[PDB]
């Protein structure tokens, strides 16, 4: 994560905290479709994990940070891109997909 930004310290502990202002009201639509698919096939725990990832993902965060006058300093969270998934089990793959899709990524 970026130095001098709010995700940095969370990389240096074994369980990351929720950084200040780190949330988003947006839910990735592909995540939503994935959760419905999981519930369709009865993968209830996985569908729940998918919905939880969709909500807790901060994808779409778009903040203006305090700074000097005459400047607008913006901070936004976007998808990483394409995530390599190396699952071992079906449930593991569903959980990996949930995490990656909820954050806007392809896999």
Provide the binding-site residues for its own copies, judged by CB under 8 A: 3-4, 6, 8-10, 12-27, 29, 32-33, 35-36, 39, 47-48, 51-52, 55-56
- Which CB atom, from 2 or from 89, has the smaller least distance to its own copies? 2
C-beta of residue 27 within 8 angstroms of C-beta of residue 42 = no
Minimum distance, C-beta of residue 11 to its own copies, in the bound complex (Å): 9
The SS3 assignment for 1 reads coil
- Which CB atom, from 4 or from 70, has the smaller least distance to its own copies? 4
Burial of 81 (0-12, 13-18, 19+ CB in 10 A): exposed
């Amino acid at each position: 994560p970026k130095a001098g930004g709010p995700l940095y310290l969370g990389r240096l502990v074994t369980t990351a905290p929720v950084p200040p202002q780190h949330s988003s009201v947006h839910t990735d639509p592909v995540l939503l479709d994935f959760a419905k698919w999981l519930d369709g096939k009865g993968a209830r725990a996985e569908a729940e994990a998918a919905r939880n990832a969709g909500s807790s993902s901060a994808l779409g965060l778009d903040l203006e940070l305090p700074g000097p006058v005459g400047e607008r300093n913006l901070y936004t969270l976007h998808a990483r891109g394409r995530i390599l998934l190396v699952p071992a089990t079906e449930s593991g793959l569903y959980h990996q997909l949930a995490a990656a899709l909820a954050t806007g990524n392809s896999v």
